[PDB]
Amino acid sequence: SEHETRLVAKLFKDYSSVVRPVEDHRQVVEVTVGLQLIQLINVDEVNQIVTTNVRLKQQWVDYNLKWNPDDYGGVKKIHIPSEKIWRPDLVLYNNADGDFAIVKFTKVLLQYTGHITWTPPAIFKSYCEIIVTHFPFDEQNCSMKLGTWTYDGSVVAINPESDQPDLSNFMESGEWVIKESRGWKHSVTYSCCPDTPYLDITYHFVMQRLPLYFIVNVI
Amino acid sequence: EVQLQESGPGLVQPSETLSLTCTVSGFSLTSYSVSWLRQPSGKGPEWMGRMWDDGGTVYNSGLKSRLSISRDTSKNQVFLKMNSLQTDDTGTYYCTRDERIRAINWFAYWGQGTLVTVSSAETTAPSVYPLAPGTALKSNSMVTLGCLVKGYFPEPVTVTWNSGALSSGVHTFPAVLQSGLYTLTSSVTVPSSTWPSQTVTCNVAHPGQQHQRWTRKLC
Amino acid sequence: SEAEGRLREKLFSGYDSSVRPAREVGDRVRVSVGLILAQLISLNEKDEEMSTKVYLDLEWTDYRLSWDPAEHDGIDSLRITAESVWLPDVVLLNNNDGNFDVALDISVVVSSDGSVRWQPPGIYRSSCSIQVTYFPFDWQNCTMVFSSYSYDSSEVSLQTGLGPDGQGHQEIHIHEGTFIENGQWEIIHKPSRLIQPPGQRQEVI
Amino acid sequence: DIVITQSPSLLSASVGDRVTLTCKGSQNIDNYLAWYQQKLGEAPKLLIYKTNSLQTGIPSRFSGSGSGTDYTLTISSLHSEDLATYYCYQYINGYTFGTGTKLELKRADAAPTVSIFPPSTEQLATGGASVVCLMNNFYPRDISVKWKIDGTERRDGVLDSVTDQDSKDSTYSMSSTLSLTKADYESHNLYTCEVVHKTSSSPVVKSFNRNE
Amino acid sequence: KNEELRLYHHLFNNYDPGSRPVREPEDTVTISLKVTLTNLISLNEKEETLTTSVWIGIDWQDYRLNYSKDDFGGIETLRVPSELVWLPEIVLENNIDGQFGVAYDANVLVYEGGSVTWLPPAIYRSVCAVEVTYFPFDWQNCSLIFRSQTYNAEEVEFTFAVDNDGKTINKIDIDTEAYTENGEWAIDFCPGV
Amino acid sequence: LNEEERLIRHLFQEKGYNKELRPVAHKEESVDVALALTLSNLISLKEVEETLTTNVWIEHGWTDNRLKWNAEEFGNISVLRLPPDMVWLPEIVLENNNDGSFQISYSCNVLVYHYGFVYWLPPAIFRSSCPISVTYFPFDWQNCSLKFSSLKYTAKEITLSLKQDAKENRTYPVEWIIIDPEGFTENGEWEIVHRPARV
Ligand SMILES: *[C@@H]1O[C@H](CO)[C@@H](O[C@@H]2O[C@H](CO)[C@@H](O[C@@H]3O[C@H](CO[C@H]4O[C@H](CO[C@H]5O[C@H](CO)[C@@H](O)[C@H](O)[C@@H]5O)[C@@H](O)[C@H](O[C@H]5O[C@H](CO)[C@@H](O)[C@H](O)[C@@H]5O)[C@@H]4O)[C@@H](O)[C@H](O[C@H]4O[C@H](CO)[C@@H](O)[C@H](O)[C@@H]4O)[C@@H]3O)[C@H](O)[C@H]2NC(C)=O)[C@H](O)[C@H]1NC(C)=O
Ligand SMILES: *[C@@H]1O[C@H](CO)[C@@H](O[C@@H]2O[C@H](CO)[C@@H](O[C@@H]3O[C@H](CO[C@H]4O[C@H](CO)[C@@H](O)[C@H](O)[C@@H]4O)[C@@H](O)[C@H](O)[C@@H]3O)[C@H](O)[C@H]2NC(C)=O)[C@H](O)[C@H]1NC(C)=O
Ligand SMILES: *[C@@H]1O[C@H](CO)[C@@H](O[C@@H]2O[C@H](CO)[C@@H](O)[C@H](O)[C@H]2NC(C)=O)[C@H](O)[C@H]1NC(C)=O
Ligand SMILES: *[C@@H]1O[C@H](CO)[C@@H](O)[C@H](O)[C@H]1NC(C)=O
Ligand SMILES: CC(=O)OCC[N+](C)(C)C
Ligand SMILES: [Cu+2]
């Protein structure tokens, strides 16, 4: 009745959310990133902006947030505010008019092994090159370039959870059918930072328009 | 500097309640946790429970119902109380000061440990039977003869040969429990011509009821 | 910059930004309200709303923030984040969207004599009664009403900001070399007036 | 919880020898292994934690190494001070302790002084007929004892114990007993003690017939 | 002195809103849910957003907030800011504007015996796929999905509120003193599962 | 023991770092701040609202000698990443914004280097005011601009300068908007003819 409070107090007594959660600073933080697409909210063709409801699952091990379950009556998992812990600064590179990073700091699930699972919701309003040629029978290929903004690949390595986005919770859109989806990890060198390649995962969705509305009202 | 001293009854009746006091010096209980360990006879040690620095407690899941732990920060004492005692509880009980790194704890210092024996047997005087060879198979200047001590309870029992005349040539094998009572043996090296003529006597004392015997050689 | 840290700690030791810097209980705080127009963003006839980007020019004396510069290594002025000093709650009363406050709490400048100057940028959407008649040759007379929301005229006295020579230049300041000229509207007159109360409050319009 | 095993159970080495005690878990211990030194009648002393962090005041001759599920404790040069029992234990998931490795100074092999004693008249008067067989000052501790009665082996009622190393000569001493009733004893006449030890290819045997 | 201050100090001087109100970690917190619809603000077919104003009746037992009125001058209810108590963090999962939580963080009511009640007002915009086939004579099966944002089914458990007659209200509650009819959309059924 | 945490303790608790004081030996000194702008995407130019929307990365750079450390004393840590709330910032804002979004959109971590250089590359979406020359539409070209200055500091307190870059061990100022072929998305309506930068 006081053991979970004791655990939280012991973990964070001198925890630092500034330093990376590794035993040794030369180690790399291995972050698993899984984009879950909940709903294709909008595809703004004229503004070339795609609005999507997503869950950006992030998983990593915090070396300092381990505990022994026997010390706390077998407590093997706890929920803690994400603002207290170190987090990967995943930024949507191709943001058009939304937020770059996560702003809804939900609680993370922390396990006795130090494994943190964070699944914050986000509404990504990403830029997409709307190809007009075959409209209204066009297929659109819209993508989300997600990566750690300040941590480079030698410092925090992000890895895709799966080759494809998690569409299991996808609310079927009445205008667009996702014919294909895939996630590709890339390392690229920016002119800002020529000696350190930065990792990103570009999730992409091949969306085909359902033409029936435009067939009826235009064609 | 840092020292811990367990204290308590060396013999407790089965189904009675054990009580132990871990006296503490060199540190304050308000800043160091105190764990309790026990080592059952013929087994490796096991963790029983911990008194937290914040005054909370946690217990081994196998012993949670049987254990309570408490402390007096003014006296620098940690108390263990255990009920429903059984024969299998017989062993050495340690209290340990626990070090920490964040939420992880380990035993850094041990007390000297108190041997706790759980047995119903009442204190009983030893029998002291002489041991003499069944055949004159040897006549050397160094032959071994001894005495058999059986039936006493509890430990310790002490054996000497002609009191202070025992010399270094004396061995005292560890006592053994049979049918709920102890048996012990000892031997001395003596010339084959000496032991039939000199009154070579094993002197045995049992502090459990200040009992004393002397048994001479008989054959 | 050790002396600046020492002075900054000295000034705010025992300071209270929630308490207005009246020395005696009857003393009023005089706040000079200037306005610098950076851009007439738009005028909306449907909403009867004028959107402007402005810099305020608020100046008052806070005696608690005075110091002798010769005691503090010659520091004759100090720049301090506005949230840590007492600020007059000057707000746009005639706003149309509920945004009373300024857009960015930039730092105030504090002089060693305790004169505090604050020039926060504001994005404002004031209500403006549109002269519908002579469209499209019409001219509009839009007003921005700035007043302390809470403090009475007996606690904070607003004033129109003087000119750099101390002249009563009661006008909206426009830096004609950098002002973003609006493509549809021409600014002809830009006066300001202090309005005396009819517990009542003064207004600078 | 993570099960832990140690090897060897008993290790003999001479002063100055390098020794490497081994500790192996059933699961990844993640370097959260500690070592402590226990002496008979003395408070256990922590040597090493986090598999390589030397405890303050521990001699630098102690060092630890390992990762994953296998770990080792190294004594770079064995002192006589270091003859003790060493336990590894784990504190990342529950608390589990090894069985412990007992470390003894190596000694020249010696044959046991074997002797056998019939139940004396005083024991028989009380109805006790326990036979006893002794093996003084032998090394190594590897020894086995068998009771044979009228040539037939006996195992019921057999019990024995072995002393620690003698502080002067490091030899072991062992005693063994065969508890019998007066009726069961008198039903037989031949008794012999058979001692098996590494110093000979054939056992040492001692025997008696009836009362002395 | 005000007895409410003694009660507040007694309850909250040693209270942690982070941990669930369970004596053992494996215990479920049973939540009683009673969504009360104040009005159907609109159904925007073009954006497929249903807008509703609701009261989210949330009741649960918190043994740490247990008190007896006899010990505190007969206080039978204490109003406490919801940030001070543990909350199940119930959110509208099928929202569309990203407003998961309630619109006003109303005080919780800590009744004697440890019962905690929360009834915040919320405006929710939620995904409702519109079947336009029979327009304007169409009917729409909009839905509201409520879940804990944090805790799984073995940590927090939902149940429907029970009426004074003992019948479970397995539907959206409508209060005649609060409900205002929408002039465009009638409401025929509102079952909860 | 993680060397990063010991280093941060040294820099901030032991040294007593104050984020509100400029990194200067004397108040009379100005902080030299180098700016560059990397244009990632010209989101749109809305002629009716006269508003240019651009996705950009503002490369801030300045020296804070209070954040110097010897790399060999802290496990060879050459770079450290800190929340911008921890360090002094030059507080540079888009002056000619059209909507009140003065500050950068995302306050990313600051990068601090052992030799005291402080580096910051926050991403931002800006809606600057861009008056439209409709005369030659649709064959028109538009002279939009983004004007960056500090409001919390002045030329007496901070000196703005363009990012300097080096080729053949000779330095030159980056007098243009940086376009990075890995980061840049070609706009389908607008071709960037010139992209100068001036202090
Ligand atoms: C819709 O649009 C999206 C984008 O908007 C588009 O997505 C592209 O999809 C294609 C496939 O359809 C992707 O192509 C694949 O990319 C894979 C990843 O490549 C990257 O990673 C490689 C990893 O290698 C090493 O990388 C580093 C070292 O740099 C190291 O740390 C790693 O451990 C690893 O060992 C890397 O090699 C690769 O490099 C590419 O780019 C560089 C320069 O850009 C070039 O020099 C290289 O030659 C190479 O092209 C890159 O960094 C890749 O694994 C995969 O390879 C498979 O296919 C190729 C042939 O296609 C085979 O040769 C190979 O054996 C594999 O079978 C393939 O190249 C592409 O990356 C996506 N791009 C983006 C931006 O998302 C969708 O296709 C569009 N869909 C439509 C229209 O329907
Ligand atoms: C209004 O919308 C509601 C939400 O869409 C509708 O309720 C859903 O209606 C569908 C109709 O297909 C039901 O799906 C069927 O469910 C049955 C029951 O199995 C259930 O349990 C199993 C085991 O747990 C599970 O696998 C199923 O998914 C169901 O949960 C199945 O046998 C069928 O194969 C099929 O899945 C939904 O179950 C039902 N859900 C709820 C919560 O009511 C509702 O019908 C709509 N009403 C109107 C009037 O339009
Ligand atoms: C909550 O607290 C009340 C008040 O103490 C408990 O009800 C009983 O109160 C009397 C006070 O006169 C105590 O003597 C009893 O021990 C209390 N318990 C019972 C079971 O009667 C109540 O039990 C507490 N718990 C709950 C769940 O309501
Ligand atoms: C730092 O790196 C140098 C080589 O560049 C090496 O000799 C030295 O031991 C390293 N020091 C630490 C503390 O890692
Ligand atoms: C160092 C830093 O913040 O870099 C950000 C820019 N990026 C992610 C394109 C390299
Ligand atoms: Cu608890």
SS (H, E, C) E36-73: EEEEEEEEECCCCEEEEEEEEEEEEECHHHCCCHHHCC
Beta strand C121-127 with B201-206 is unpaired
* Closest of B115, B145, B101, B127 to residue B181, by C-alpha: B127
Q: How far is CA F65 from CA A69, A144, F70, F82, F115, in A?
A: 45, 39, 12, 15, 8
Supply φ then ψ for residue F151, to 5 degrees.
-100, -30
Which of chain D's residues have a Cβ under 8 Å away from the Cβ of B106?
32, 34, 49, 91
User: Rounded to a whole number, what is the distance in angstroms from the first to the last CA of chain E?
Assistant: 48
* Closest of A39, A34, A58 to residue A123, by C-alpha: A39
Resolution for this model in angstroms, one decimal place?
2.7
Give the distance (Å) from ligand 3 centre to CA of residue E86.
22
CA distance F39 to F54: 7
Question: Domains of chain B: which residue ranges?
Answer: 1-120, 121-219
Residue D79: how many other CB atoms lie within 10 Å: 11
**3-state secondary structure (DSSP) of residue B143:** strand
Report CB contact under 8 Å: A6, B47.
Answer: no
**3-state secondary structure (DSSP) of residue B75:** coil
Question: C102 with C121: CB under 8 angstroms?
Answer: yes
Ligand 5: residues whose CB is within 6 Å?
A 149-150, 190, 192-193, 198; F 57, 108, 111, 121, 183
CA distance A5 to A11: 10
**3-state secondary structure (DSSP) of residue B85:** coil
Domains of chain D: 1-107 (2.60.40.10), 108-210 (2.60.40.10)
From the list E19, E25, E100, the residue facing A5 with the nearest CB is E19
A108-111 long-range Cβ contacts below 8 angstroms, 24+ apart: A108/A79, A108/A80, A108/A81, A108/A82, A109/A77, A109/A78, A109/A79, A110/A62, A110/A65, A110/A77, A110/A78, A110/A79, A110/A80, A110/A85, A111/A76, A111/A77
If you measure CA to CA, which chain A residue comes closest to B64? A73
Supply φ then ψ for residue A67, to 5 degrees.
-150, 165
Q: Which residues of chain F have a Cβ shorter than 8 Å from any chain C Cβ?
A: 18, 20-22, 24-27, 50, 91, 93, 96-100, 102-103, 129, 131-132, 151-153, 157
**3-state secondary structure (DSSP) of residue F46:** strand
Q: How was this structure determined?
A: cryo-EM
Whether the CB of E30 sits within 6 Å of ligand 2: no
Q: Which residues contact E154 (CB under 8 A, 6 or more apart)?
A: E26, E28
Q: Which amino acid is at E27?
A: D
* Closest of D90, C41, E29, E190 to residue F48, by C-alpha: C41
CA distance C56 to C122: 7
Whether the CB of E129 sits within 6 Å of ligand 2: no
Return the structure tokens found at D154.
């006996």
Residue D195 CB-half CA count within 13 A: 29
Question: E73 with E3: CB under 8 angstroms?
Answer: yes
Mutation target among C39, C54, C75 for the F interface, most CBs of F within 10 A? C39
CA distance D43 to B45: 13
CA distance B4 to B76: 10
Four-residue CA torsion sign, D50, D56, D60, D62: negative
CA distance A201 to A34: 10
Q: Tally DSSP H helices, then E strands, for chain C.
A: 1, 11
Whether the CB of A104 sits within 6 Å of ligand 1: no
Q: Provide the Cα torsion A207, A208, A210, A215; round to 10°.
A: 130
Whether the CB of A187 sits within 6 Å of ligand 1: yes
Strands (E), chain E: 29-44, 49-61, 77-80, 90-92, 108-111, 115-118, 121-127, 146-148, 156-160
Q: Quick check: A48 contacting F, CB < 8 Å?
A: yes
CA distance E19 to E86: 7
Q: Which residues contact C187 (CB under 8 A, 6 or more apart)?
A: C37, C40, C174
* Closest of C85, C88, C92 to residue C108, by C-alpha: C85
If you measure CA to CA, which chain B residue comes closest to D95? B47
Domain B121-219 listed as CATH 3.10.310.30: no
Q: Which amino acid is at B170?
A: V
SS (H, E, C) chain A: CCHHHHHHHHHHCCCCCCCCCCCCCCCCEEEEEEEEEEEEEEEECCCCEEEEEEEEEEEEECHHHCCCHHHHCCCCEEEEEHHHCCCCCEEECCECCCCCECCCCCEEEEECCCEEEECCEEEEEEECCCCCCCCCCCEEEEEEEEEECCCCCCCEEEEECCCCCECCCCECCCCEEEEEEEEEEEEECCCCCCCCCEEEEEEEEEEEECCHHHHHHCC
Return the structure tokens found at E35.
């969504």
Q: Angle at Cα D155 formed by Cα D153 and Cα D160, nearest 5°?
A: 120
Return the structure tokens found at A155.
């410092």
Question: B50 with B94: CB under 8 angstroms?
Answer: no
CA distance A144 to A204: 6
CA distance B148 to B201: 12
Q: Angle at Cα A134 formed by Cα A129 and Cα A138, nearest 5°?
A: 60
CA–chain centroid gap for A10, Å, is 29
Whether the CB of A184 sits within 6 Å of ligand 1: yes
Q: Which residues contact D144 (CB under 8 A, 6 or more apart)?
A: D195, D196, D197
- Please give all residues whose CB falls under 5 A of ion ligand 6, grouped by chain where several chains appear: A 1-3
Question: B96 with A58: CB under 8 angstroms?
Answer: no
